[PDB]
């Protein structure tokens, strides 16, 4: 597939914005996807 290093996080927020639409659910999606993002990028080396 394609994408950039923001895509998983970004698409997660978009997904849950359309499909979930709610603060609690937004927190849930954000908490996992933000951590996924941060742990992945943290495990990577940014230029």
Curated annotation (Swiss-Prot):
Inhibits protein synthesis in animal cells. Homotetramer. One of its GO terms (biological process) is defense response. Keywords: Disulfide bond, Glycosidase, Hydrolase, Plant defense, Protein synthesis inhibitor, Toxin. It catalyses: Endohydrolysis of the N-glycosidic bond at one specific adenosine on the 28S rRNA. This is Ribosome-inactivating protein luffin P1. The keyword Hydrolase applies. The keyword Isomerase does not apply. Its EC number is 3.2.2.22. Disulfide bonds join 12-33, 16-29. It comes from Luffa aegyptiaca. GO terms for molecular function: rRNA N-glycosylase activity; toxin activity. The record marks 2-3, 45-46 as: Cleavage.
């Amino acid at each position: 597939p394609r994408g950039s290093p923001r895509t998983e996080y970004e698409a997660c927020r978009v997904r849950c914005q359309v499909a979930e639409h709610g603060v609690e659910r937004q927190r849930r999606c954000q908490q996992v996807c933000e951590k996924r993002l941060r742990e992945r990028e943290g495990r990577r080396e940014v230029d």
